């Protein structure tokens, strides 16, 4: 659910590409973390600060796993 939540919020924020959303959903843990950090940076750059915060927390969760 964590991956799907990150992919959904990065989609809504437009912080990642279709290929990157797919790699978040069905890639490796490391690339999922990497792409979520990219989505955090991209969403904050686009003014989606709350979504950046949400996605940052979920990536912390992916690390904790």
């Amino acid at each position: 659910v964590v991956r799907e939540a990150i992919a959904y919020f990065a989609k809504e924020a437009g912080a990642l590409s279709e290929a990157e959303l797919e790699k978040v959903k069905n890639g490796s843990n490391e690339e999922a973390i990497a792409l979520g950090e990219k989505a955090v940076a991209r969403a904050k750059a686009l003014g989606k600060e709350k979504e950046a915060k949400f996605i940052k927390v979920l990536v912390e969760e992916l690390k904790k796993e």
Binding site: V1, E4, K53, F54
Partner: protein, 65 residues
């Protein structure tokens, strides 16, 4: 079950919002407390209905912050 889990997820979002609008927690603390407790709930009841509902309640929570 699915329906009881969804009830708990919605009630958790309302509890988190009430703490936030009372001033007891800030925005990022609200996100974290919801993410942590709702992840408990989703892993305990992992049906697709519950995963979808939790992501939607996260989106409503983030919109209302």
């Amino acid at each position: 079950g699915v329906e009881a889990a969804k009830k708990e997820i919605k009630k958790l979002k309302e509890e988190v919002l009430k703490k936030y609008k009372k001033g007891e927690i800030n925005e990022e603390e609200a996100i974290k407390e919801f993410v942590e407790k709702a992840l408990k709930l989703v892993k305990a009841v992992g049906d697709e209905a519950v995963k979808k509902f939790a992501i939607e309640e996260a989106k409503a929570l983030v919109e209302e912050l």
